[PDB]
Design an enzyme around this catalytic site. Structure first.
Site, PDB file in Angstrom:
ATOM      1  N   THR A  68     -33.855   8.433   3.509  1.00 46.11           N
ATOM      2  CA  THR A  68     -35.230   7.777   3.395  1.00 46.11           C
ATOM      3  C   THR A  68     -36.095   7.852   4.654  1.00 46.11           C
ATOM      4  OG1 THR A  68     -34.224   5.679   3.730  1.00 46.11           O
ATOM      5  CG2 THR A  68     -35.411   6.083   1.538  1.00 46.11           C
TER       6      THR A  68
ATOM      7  N   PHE B  67     -25.502   2.609  -1.521  1.00 40.61           N
ATOM      8  CA  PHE B  67     -26.717   2.241  -0.670  1.00 40.61           C
ATOM      9  C   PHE B  67     -27.676   1.320  -1.446  1.00 40.61           C
ATOM     10  CE2 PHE B  67     -28.137   5.104   3.291  1.00 40.61           C
ATOM     11  CZ  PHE B  67     -28.462   3.864   4.019  1.00 40.61           C
TER      12      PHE B  67
ATOM     13  N   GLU C 174     -20.314   4.747   9.152  1.00 36.69           N
ATOM     14  CA  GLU C 174     -21.688   5.164   9.571  1.00 36.69           C
ATOM     15  C   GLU C 174     -22.277   4.418  10.892  1.00 36.69           C
ATOM     16  OE1 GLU C 174     -26.267   6.180   7.815  1.00 36.69           O
ATOM     17  OE2 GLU C 174     -24.831   5.535   6.103  1.00 36.69           O
TER      18      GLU C 174
ATOM     19  N   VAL D 237      17.920 -11.364   4.816  1.00 31.61           N
ATOM     20  CA  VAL D 237      18.549 -10.346   3.929  1.00 31.61           C
ATOM     21  C   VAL D 237      17.592  -9.119   3.713  1.00 31.61           C
ATOM     22  CG1 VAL D 237      19.558  -9.779   1.651  1.00 31.61           C
ATOM     23  CG2 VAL D 237      20.057 -11.999   2.680  1.00 31.61           C
TER      24      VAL D 237
ATOM     25  N   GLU E 256     -22.578  10.380  -4.628  1.00 34.43           N
ATOM     26  CA  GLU E 256     -22.709   9.028  -4.945  1.00 34.43           C
ATOM     27  C   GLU E 256     -23.164   8.777  -6.358  1.00 34.43           C
ATOM     28  OE1 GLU E 256     -25.605   8.211  -0.847  1.00 34.43           O
ATOM     29  OE2 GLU E 256     -24.367   6.604  -1.937  1.00 34.43           O
TER      30      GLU E 256
ATOM     31  N   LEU F 152      23.247 -20.408  -0.146  1.00 38.09           N
ATOM     32  CA  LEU F 152      23.465 -19.997  -1.550  1.00 38.09           C
ATOM     33  C   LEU F 152      24.446 -18.852  -1.767  1.00 38.09           C
ATOM     34  CD1 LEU F 152      22.992 -20.092  -4.472  1.00 38.09           C
ATOM     35  CD2 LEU F 152      20.868 -18.864  -4.150  1.00 38.09           C
TER      36      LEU F 152
ATOM     37  N   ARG G 197     -33.974   1.371  -0.967  1.00 36.54           N
ATOM     38  CA  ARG G 197     -33.391   2.201  -1.961  1.00 36.54           C
ATOM     39  C   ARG G 197     -33.173   1.375  -3.261  1.00 36.54           C
ATOM     40  NH1 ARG G 197     -31.161   7.082  -2.960  1.00 36.54           N
ATOM     41  NH2 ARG G 197     -31.226   7.610  -0.733  1.00 36.54           N
TER      42      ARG G 197
ATOM     43  N   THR H 231      11.559  -9.318   3.303  1.00 39.02           N
ATOM     44  CA  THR H 231      10.197  -9.247   2.710  1.00 39.02           C
ATOM     45  C   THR H 231       9.358 -10.538   2.770  1.00 39.02           C
ATOM     46  OG1 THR H 231      11.136  -9.739   0.482  1.00 39.02           O
ATOM     47  CG2 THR H 231      10.893  -7.559   1.076  1.00 39.02           C
TER      48      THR H 231
ATOM     49  N   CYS I 145       0.841  -1.221   0.000  1.00 40.03           N
ATOM     50  CA  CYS I 145       0.000   0.000   0.000  1.00 40.03           C
ATOM     51  C   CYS I 145       0.892   1.294   0.000  1.00 40.03           C
ATOM     52  CB  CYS I 145      -0.967  -0.036   1.166  1.00 40.03           C
ATOM     53  SG  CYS I 145      -0.395   0.786   2.706  1.00 40.03           S
TER      54      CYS I 145
ATOM     55  N   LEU J  10      18.899 -17.211   8.067  1.00 37.41           N
ATOM     56  CA  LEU J  10      19.368 -16.066   7.196  1.00 37.41           C
ATOM     57  C   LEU J  10      18.213 -15.176   6.959  1.00 37.41           C
ATOM     58  CD1 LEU J  10      21.586 -16.867   4.312  1.00 37.41           C
ATOM     59  CD2 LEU J  10      22.015 -17.025   6.775  1.00 37.41           C
TER      60      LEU J  10
HETATM   61  C1  LIG Z   1       4.881  -6.295  -1.602  1.00 36.79           C
HETATM   62  C2  LIG Z   1       5.407  -7.573  -2.174  1.00 36.79           C
HETATM   63  C3  LIG Z   1       5.257  -7.971  -3.515  1.00 36.79           C
HETATM   64  C4  LIG Z   1       5.805  -9.142  -4.031  1.00 36.79           C
HETATM   65  N1  LIG Z   1       5.624  -9.507  -5.334  1.00 36.79           N
HETATM   66  C5  LIG Z   1       6.236 -10.671  -5.772  1.00 36.79           C
HETATM   67  C6  LIG Z   1       6.023 -10.990  -7.067  1.00 36.79           C
HETATM   68  O1  LIG Z   1       5.541 -10.141  -7.825  1.00 36.79           O
HETATM   69  N2  LIG Z   1       6.585 -12.121  -7.555  1.00 36.79           N
HETATM   70  C7  LIG Z   1       7.365 -12.936  -6.758  1.00 36.79           C
HETATM   71  O2  LIG Z   1       7.877 -13.962  -7.233  1.00 36.79           O
HETATM   72  N3  LIG Z   1       7.567 -12.629  -5.455  1.00 36.79           N
HETATM   73  C8  LIG Z   1       7.016 -11.493  -4.983  1.00 36.79           C
HETATM   74  N4  LIG Z   1       7.251 -11.148  -3.666  1.00 36.79           N
HETATM   75  C9  LIG Z   1       8.320 -11.875  -2.776  1.00 36.79           C
HETATM   76  C10 LIG Z   1       9.690 -11.194  -2.727  1.00 36.79           C
HETATM   77  O3  LIG Z   1      10.206 -11.286  -4.016  1.00 36.79           O
HETATM   78  C11 LIG Z   1      10.612 -12.076  -1.963  1.00 36.79           C
HETATM   79  O4  LIG Z   1      10.319 -11.876  -0.638  1.00 36.79           O
HETATM   80  C12 LIG Z   1      12.034 -11.729  -2.251  1.00 36.79           C
HETATM   81  O5  LIG Z   1      12.227 -12.432  -3.448  1.00 36.79           O
HETATM   82  C13 LIG Z   1      12.899 -12.221  -1.077  1.00 36.79           C
HETATM   83  O6  LIG Z   1      14.200 -11.692  -0.848  1.00 36.79           O
HETATM   84  P1  LIG Z   1      14.561 -11.446   0.716  1.00 36.79           P
HETATM   85  O7  LIG Z   1      15.839 -10.577   0.833  1.00 36.79           O
HETATM   86  O8  LIG Z   1      13.416 -10.680   1.364  1.00 36.79           O
HETATM   87  O9  LIG Z   1      14.458 -12.776   1.601  1.00 36.79           O
HETATM   88  P2  LIG Z   1      14.181 -12.739   3.187  1.00 36.79           P
HETATM   89  O10 LIG Z   1      12.814 -12.209   3.301  1.00 36.79           O
HETATM   90  O11 LIG Z   1      15.231 -12.087   4.001  1.00 36.79           O
HETATM   91  O12 LIG Z   1      14.149 -14.264   3.549  1.00 36.79           O
HETATM   92  C14 LIG Z   1      13.936 -15.091   2.408  1.00 36.79           C
HETATM   93  C15 LIG Z   1      14.541 -16.488   2.359  1.00 36.79           C
HETATM   94  O13 LIG Z   1      15.872 -16.432   1.915  1.00 36.79           O
HETATM   95  C16 LIG Z   1      16.560 -17.275   2.769  1.00 36.79           C
HETATM   96  N5  LIG Z   1      17.960 -17.618   2.353  1.00 36.79           N
HETATM   97  C17 LIG Z   1      18.437 -18.900   2.452  1.00 36.79           C
HETATM   98  N6  LIG Z   1      19.644 -18.987   1.979  1.00 36.79           N
HETATM   99  C18 LIG Z   1      19.965 -17.803   1.566  1.00 36.79           C
HETATM  100  C19 LIG Z   1      21.155 -17.418   0.981  1.00 36.79           C
HETATM  101  N7  LIG Z   1      22.028 -18.270   0.443  1.00 36.79           N
HETATM  102  N8  LIG Z   1      21.229 -16.104   0.567  1.00 36.79           N
HETATM  103  C20 LIG Z   1      20.112 -15.234   0.803  1.00 36.79           C
HETATM  104  N9  LIG Z   1      18.928 -15.660   1.423  1.00 36.79           N
HETATM  105  C21 LIG Z   1      18.906 -16.930   1.766  1.00 36.79           C
HETATM  106  C22 LIG Z   1      15.972 -17.103   4.170  1.00 36.79           C
HETATM  107  O14 LIG Z   1      15.964 -18.373   4.791  1.00 36.79           O
HETATM  108  C23 LIG Z   1      14.522 -16.852   3.798  1.00 36.79           C
HETATM  109  O15 LIG Z   1      13.638 -17.946   3.725  1.00 36.79           O
HETATM  110  C24 LIG Z   1       6.590  -9.962  -3.192  1.00 36.79           C
HETATM  111  C25 LIG Z   1       6.711  -9.541  -1.832  1.00 36.79           C
HETATM  112  C26 LIG Z   1       6.113  -8.377  -1.317  1.00 36.79           C
HETATM  113  C27 LIG Z   1       5.734  -8.401   0.130  1.00 36.79           C
HETATM  114  S1  FES Z   2       1.083  -0.215   5.233  1.00 35.42           S
HETATM  115 FE1  FES Z   2       1.280  -0.817   3.090  1.00 35.42          FE
HETATM  116  S2  FES Z   2       3.440  -1.214   2.819  1.00 35.42           S
HETATM  117 FE2  FES Z   2       3.231  -0.522   4.897  1.00 35.42          FE
END
Ligand SMILES: Cc1cc2nc3c(=O)[nH]c(=O)nc-3n(C[C@H](O)[C@H](O)[C@H](O)COP(=O)(O)OP(=O)(O)OC[C@H]3O[C@@H](n4cnc5c(N)ncnc54)[C@H](O)[C@@H]3O)c2cc1C
Ligand code: FES
Ligand code: FES
Lengths: 1264, 49, 99, 49
Positions: free
Chosen positions: A954, A858, A746, A230, A1205, A375, A824, A233, A46, A228
């Protein structure tokens, strides 16, 4: 190594003791109290939580800038990074920064909440690329959503930065980028003095930030279950929402070896830590510098990354992450797998090198890794000569599908050396082709390969009908249709089968420079919304003893409740007490037809309904307590679906109906009879500010004061006073603003306020609580879906003569407003047609789903949609044109509606005529079938729809309101009135009026907040009449003041206004006065069909072009022209703003938004990730709005019509234009079928469109 | 005078448009308002006492 | 209120003029956006002047109500209020006085 | 009055006052005061806006 150190807005922060679980927002928001960096989902997409990280690079000794979402980013990642915030670039107590002022002054901030987010998104763009392209700006914004504005003003305000009218862009201040704030010189003195590894310790988790590769590997080797992190997300989502807890995390990320890019002989090679955002950047240019056949795989990776997700996220997530994370639906893994990519794995004493293939993912989110293996790097390969690649994704942990495809031929010929088809979203894990792939090996790229492939694609990856995710033959077809797309675009790359704007009306010549009614003056507070400074709710500071709340809720759909166990929860640190139904000292039976319970007693009736709440010191403790109390249930049976309901005979009081004529007569008297049924889907409010309540108890005589995000002030007051068991006059409720309401606030607002109130009453000290996006979408619930069946008789001219229609409305597990909505609905089955014999009914169905409530519209927008369906089914059964048919049976000036109210001064045909004009329907229509003739696989559609909307409450006695005006001894005025601002300019309109009536400059009058002891007994801030009713009241009060003053004006008729006030003061006159208003001569009776239910009508008319892609189910939203009657607008900038917004919400409701529920009744679909509201990307390409000129409305404050509306229905046009192109693709691939009559349901999604576009492939899939 | 409650003032600034709200031990409500508004240099109607 | 019963006297009066029990009327605090432009709470006249004002405001309310009292002259005071509400009368009023 | 709770960021004040009966005022020295723990700032006549 313990102290973490980062900078915020320029200043240093040295935090002795960090807990790895506290997220940056939150540090920001509630430790260094800088509000205004808002929370919107917590889930990532968002972007209202957006900020900017600047840090010093070290590897390329450079200083870099990027955006990121602070709702997600742990503070332990941020060592020695610097944060810029919204309140970093500019402020109203100094200079606004131009990104700030332009978004304000161009009308781009109505409700105001998503505003800082977009501002930073933009702000960062400029700091990287100081003069961008309208495409690059286009595009910063995938990350950010707004609900109120429909986007247009945003982009048109910023278009400015890159290469009878509404705002002057030539007056904007100019922008000198030598003047942004400096990279703190104090990091930089660091930067030499080299890193060593750090450990922070938390309350539950321990975080080790590693610094060489050696220390990573040893760490992992002696503690292999260490996690791990990084980009975070992933883990971020898992730890927050699927309550998992990994107690030891190590984050690599600093490690030079994991962040390197390298140009091999053979492909490019990227360190696992690198962010997507730089994988992109790399490829993007190294494709443009390079022989266009080595670059075939590259073009595919980049192809996925445009529709991946959006900048705040691409700048944090690693390829490493995505690859190993490994979800069923990764869009990257198919491509890497089909690519046959090249991974480099390591441990201490281990140096493996695997090529990716079907073998790499065995089971559910597992890989080939051993626990002590990490990795190191991926390598994406150049493409060999006569090797071909595409990638596909299609949109709106299972469903959609995404694919990578590869082929290689025996050189200097067609033949097929290698072939691989890899598909995301069709199984457990990312799968391969392969049986089907095998057999195709050394044939020719020719017809009977295209067949054999699609044949095997249906057998191999066949789906059981129970398979989770649902949707089955959409999910199916896609597999082929992607291939087919693929087959074709190969061929093309050899020998290749050849054949061969917004306007409105000026104010009077005469009128004053400082009378402002009718001029387009921007929203009283947009500067401050753009600046961070406007305070919304939880934005209001704590007190020093304030608790948090958070409430506990039923995990079954109907059951008794065998007992509650609180033991696991009293173990949490800071836990205060658990509130339940036995504690209200007042009356536990509340709601609004007294249907419902403040806290459940003895049994739970839907998926859940409040059982109680827990009270603690922080909200993260609040979470862990919640989690804690565990309940035990015995399980009774459930009504869910509309049917059931009827098959069981449920529901909510006796069948409503309206009738006029006879009717037996029509149908006997008539040429054709059709006869059909259709279903309209439900919908989510999704405002940005979600619900909430700071409740503060004073402690003498039961007094309490509550700060509350509501549309309904009155009620929040009484049902608190009822539940507590005290006189209304000890309760005071105040609302200064809201992040939007659209009805959703409301009534339902009370469910929270009520609980919070009691926790304060009990513990004797302030308590607040505010919902997370996921709780809110469960609990508060939706717009009402409807099932209707119809029968309509008509002549072969197309003139209609009789019509019969049955409605039901699914309600949920408390009555609420649901009755008034149905009514309505009935008032609107005619849309805009006269129709002399007609019977409409409806029912109200009892279910174990959470109670549905009031939503912009409504019930009206439900059909007017029904009829309008029905209608184009006429026109098609006749043989057409669809225009001629609607034009043909329009109400005409002075007729009467099926409820016998007269249509006086009826504008509709002028809107009609004047729309087809400018929009130029014909010729455009012709130009369309033409494209349909010449294109086989994409098609287009065109439509033109009408609308009329009754204005007024209403229940007649709700049409009233009231105000309170003070004049200080210094000249300044103080206005308040009954109704509340949800970001729709009520206040700015209320000022405009009072400025005029009193004849003193807008500048001199201020309104501060809305409250229940300034003006009591106020109607919900509701059904568009909110302007008009307070409009009136403000007037009256104005007048009583000017009468008081006359004498002193008379005696000195050329003196100042200050002059006349000091004057009257010393002579002894009142300077404070009240003011009130009633809408007169209102009241329709149901059994008598007479008398008067509305006060006037809004009118208008819309015209839309669309083009579908009938291979995938996706469409473009090509053009749209509207013409709207507003009367004589009070403010044409804010109306319009109103128009476009509502129109976009229709967009969502008819084509984009779907809720899903498990078979046994728990809502499945809970955030911006699964509920897709319409984005910057989704608005019409050209978007033309026009207010209708010369047409004053004499029944309402200074000539103006209501505007809330009515216009939302007009999106209808995009739905029917969408039904039209469907025709055209059915008639190409169905061989024939005369005059078709086919079932289309709302909301028209990708699934439902694709599904109904019949052909070769649909037929091969045939036989949650 | 020797009253038991001696003088005093909790002053709380809201931060948009100069608003401020003040909790004050006084006999004279009016004046506490204007001479605050004078000293601050803003319209009386942003002050509440 | 400086501890001299202004509030308790202000209640007493309004209880009488309106003819409903002291128990049912509450005063909470004094403020400059409920009633602006007020004289110091000062020279003993503080009782008498607000005394008056409270009265007036009282009277404007009872005029508003007459009709509904007339039509049901043996019903509750709550009866006459739900009543006037649904018929659409103001229930909020000002009140002033000069010596 | 001060009975009304703090907020969580609320400061205290306390005001500085003339130790002679009529005089000119030759200059003000703030140095010894910025050494106290928790000191925020000294407000004077040059600050009223
Ligand atoms: C808003 C949003 C939109 C998204 N849209 C998509 C999308 O469009 N398509 C899609 O495919 N994905 C999507 N994702 C997922 C996002 O791509 C992944 O979370 C991202 O690929 C992960 O990288 P990271 O640094 O966050 O991993 P982290 O969140 O830090 O953790 C991820 C994994 O990597 C691990 N890991 C293990 N070994 C290693 C190592 N060798 N090196 C690095 N990490 C390791 C950790 O154990 C963990 O499980 C979306 C996520 C968000 C929330
Ligand atoms: S409230 Fe949507 S990304 Fe944080
Ligand atoms: S202005 Fe964007 S959500 Fe309201």
């Amino acid at each position: 190594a313990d102290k973490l150190v980062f900078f915020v807005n320029g200043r240093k922060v040295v935090e002795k003791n960090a807990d790895p679980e506290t997220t940056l927002l939150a540090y920001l928001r509630r430790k260094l109290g800088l509000s205004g960096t808002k929370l919107g989902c917590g889930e990532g997409g968002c972007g209202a939580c957006t900020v900017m990280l600047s840090k010093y690079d070290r590897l390329q000794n450079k200083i870099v800038h990027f955006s990121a979402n602070a709702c997600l980013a742990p503070i332990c990642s941020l060592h020695h990074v610097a944060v810029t915030t919204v309140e970093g670039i500019g402020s109203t107590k100094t200079r606004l920064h131009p990104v700030q002022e332009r978004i304000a002054k161009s009308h781009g901030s109505q409700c105001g909440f998503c505003t800082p987010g977009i501002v930073m998104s933009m702000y960062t763009l400029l700091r990287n690329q100081p003069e961008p392209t309208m495409e690059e700006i286009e595009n910063a914004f995938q990350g950010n959503l707004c609900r109120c504005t429909g986007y247009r003003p945003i982009l048109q305000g910023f278009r400015t930065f890159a290469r009878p009218s509404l705002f002057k862009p030539e007056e904007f201040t100019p922008l000198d980028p030598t003047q942004e704030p400096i990279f703190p010189p104090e990091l930089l003195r660091l930067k030499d003095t080299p890193r060593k590894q750090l450990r922070f310790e938390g309350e539950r988790v321990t975080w080790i930030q590693a610094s060489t590769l050696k220390e990573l590997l040893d760490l992992k080797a002696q503690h292999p279950d260490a996690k791990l992190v990084v980009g975070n997300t992933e883990i971020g989502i898992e730890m927050k929402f699927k309550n998992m807890l990994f107690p030891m995390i190590v984050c690599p990320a600093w490690i030079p070896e994991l962040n390197s890019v390298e140009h091999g002989p053979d492909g490019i090679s990227f360190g696992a830590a690198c962010p997507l955002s730089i994988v992109e950047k790399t490829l993007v240019d190294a494709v443009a510098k390079l022989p266009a056949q080595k670059t075939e795989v590259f073009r595919g990776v980049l192809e996925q990354l445009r529709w991946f997700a959006g900048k705040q996220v691409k700048s944090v997530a690693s390829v490493g992450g995505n690859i190993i994370t490994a979800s069923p639906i990764s869009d990257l893994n198919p491509v890497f797998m089909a690519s046959g990519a090249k991974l480099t794995l390591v441990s201490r004493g281990t140096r493996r090198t695997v090529q990716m293939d079907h073998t790499f993912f065995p089971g559910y989110r597992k890989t080939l890794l051993s626990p002590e293996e990490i990795l190191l790097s991926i390598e994406i390969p150049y493409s060999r000569e006569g090797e071909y690649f595409s990638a596909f994704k299609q949109a709106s942990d299972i469903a959609k599908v995404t694919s990578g495809m590869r082929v290689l031929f025996k050189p200097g010929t067609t033949e097929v050396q290698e072939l691989a088809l890899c598909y995301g979203g069709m199984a457990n894990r990312t799968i391969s082709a392969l049986k089907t792939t095998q057999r195709q090996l050394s044939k020719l790229w020719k017809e009977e390969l295209l067949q054999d492939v699609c044949a095997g694609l249906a057998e191999e990856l066949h789906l059981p009908p129970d398979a989770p995710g649902g949707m089955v033959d959409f999910r199916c077809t896609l597999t082929l249709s992607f291939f087919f797309k693929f087959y074709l675009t190969v061929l093309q790359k050899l020998g290749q089968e050849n054949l061969e704007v917004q306007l409105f009306q000026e104010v009077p010549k005469g009128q004053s420079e400082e009378d402002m009614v009718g001029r387009p003056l921007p929203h009283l507070a947009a500067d401050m919304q753009a600046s961070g400074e406007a305070v919304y709710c939880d934005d209001i500071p704590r007190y020093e003893n304030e608790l948090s709340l958070r409430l506990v809720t039923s995990t079954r759909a109907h059951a008794k409740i065998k007992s509650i166990d609180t033991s696991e929860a009293k173990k949490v640190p800071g836990f205060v007490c658990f509130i339940s139904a036995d504690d209200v000292p007042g009356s536990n039976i509340t709601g609004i037809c007294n249907d419902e319970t403040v806290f459940a007693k003895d049994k739970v009736t839907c998926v859940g309904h409040i059982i109680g709440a827990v009270v603690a010191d922080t909200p993260e403790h609040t979470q862990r307590a919640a989690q804690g109390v565990k309940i035990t249930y015995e399980e009774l049976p459930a009504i869910i679906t509309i049917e059931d309901a009827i098959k069981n005979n449920s529901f909510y009081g006796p069948e409503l109906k309206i009738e006029k004529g006879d009717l037996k007569k029509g149908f006997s008297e008539a040429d054709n009879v059709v006869s059909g049924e259709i279903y309209i889907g439900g919908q989510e409010h999704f405002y940005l500010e979600t619900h909430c309540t700071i409740a503060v108890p004073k402690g003498e005589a039961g007094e309490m004061e509550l700060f509350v995000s509501t549309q309904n002030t009155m009620k929040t007051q009484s049902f608190v006073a009822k539940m507590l068991g005290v006189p209304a006059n000890r309760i005071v409720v105040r609302v200064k603003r809201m992040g939007g309401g659209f009805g959703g606030k409301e009534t339902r607002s009370t469910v929270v306020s009520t609980a919070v109130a009691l926790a304060a009453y009990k513990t004797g000290r302030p308590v607040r609580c505010m919902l997370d996006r996921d709780e809110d979408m469960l609990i508060t619930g939706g717009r009402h879906p409807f099932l209707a069946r119809y029968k309509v008789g008509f002549m072969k001219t197309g003139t209609v003569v009789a019509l019969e229609v049955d409605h039901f409305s699914n309600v949920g597990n408390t009555q609420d407003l649901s009755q008034s909505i149905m009514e309505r609905a009935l008032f609107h089955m005619d849309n805009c047609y006269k129709i002399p014999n007609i019977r409409g009914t409806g029912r109200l169905c009892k279910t174990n789903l959470p109670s549905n409530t009031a939503f912009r519209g409504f019930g009206g927008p439900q059909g007017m949609l029904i009829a309008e369906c029905w209608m184009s089914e006429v026109a098609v059964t006749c043989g057409m044109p669809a225009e001629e048919v609607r034009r043909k049976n329009l109400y005409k000036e002075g007729d009467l509606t099926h409820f016998n109210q007269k249509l006086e001064g009826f504008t509709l045909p002028r809107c009609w005529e004047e729309c087809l004009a400018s929009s130029q329907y014909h010729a455009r229509k012709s130009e369309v079938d033409k494209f349909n003739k010449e294109n086989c696989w994409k098609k287009r559609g065109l439509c033109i729809i009408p609308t009329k909307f009754g204005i007024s409450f209403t229940v007649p006695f709700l049409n009233q309101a009231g105000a309170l005006l003070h004049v200080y001894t210094d000249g300044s005025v103080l206005l308040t009135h009954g109704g509340t601002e949800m970001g729709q300019g009520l206040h700015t309109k209320m000022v405009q009026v009072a400025s005029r009536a009193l004849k003193i400059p807008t500048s001199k009058i201020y309104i501060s907040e809305t409250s229940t002891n300034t003006v009591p007994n106020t109607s919900p801030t509701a059904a568009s009449v909110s302007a008009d009713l307070n409009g009136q009241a403000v007037y009256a009060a104005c007048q009583t003041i000017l009468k008081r003053l006359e004498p002193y004006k008379k005696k000195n008729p050329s003196g100042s206004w200050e002059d006349w006030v000091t004057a009257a003061y010393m002579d002894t006159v009142s300077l404070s006065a009240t003011g009130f208003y009633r809408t007169p001569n209102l009241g329709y009776s149901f059994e008598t069909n007479s008398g008067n239910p509305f006060h006037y009508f809004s009118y208008g008319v819309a015209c839309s072009e669309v083009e579908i892609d009938c291979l995938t189910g996706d469409h473009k939203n090509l053009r749209t022209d509207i013409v709207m009657d507003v009367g004589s607008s009070l403010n044409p900038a804010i109306d319009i703003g109103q128009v476009e917004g509502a129109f976009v919400q229709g967009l969502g409701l008819f084509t984009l938004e779907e809720l899903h529920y498990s078979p046994e009744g728990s809502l499945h679909t809970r955030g911006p990730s699964t509920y897709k509201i319409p984005a910057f990307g989704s608005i019409p390409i050209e978007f033309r709005v026009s207010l209708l000129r010369d047409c004053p409305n004499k029944k309402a404050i200074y000539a103006s019509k209501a505007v809330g509306e009515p216009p939302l229905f007009l999106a209808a046009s995009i739905f029917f234009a969408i039904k039209d192109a469907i025709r055209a693709a059915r008639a190409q691939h169905t061989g024939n079928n005369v005059k078709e009559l086919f079932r289309l349901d709302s909301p028209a999604t990708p699934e439902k469109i694709r599904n109904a576009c019949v052909d070769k492939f649909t037929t091969l899939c045939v036989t949650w």
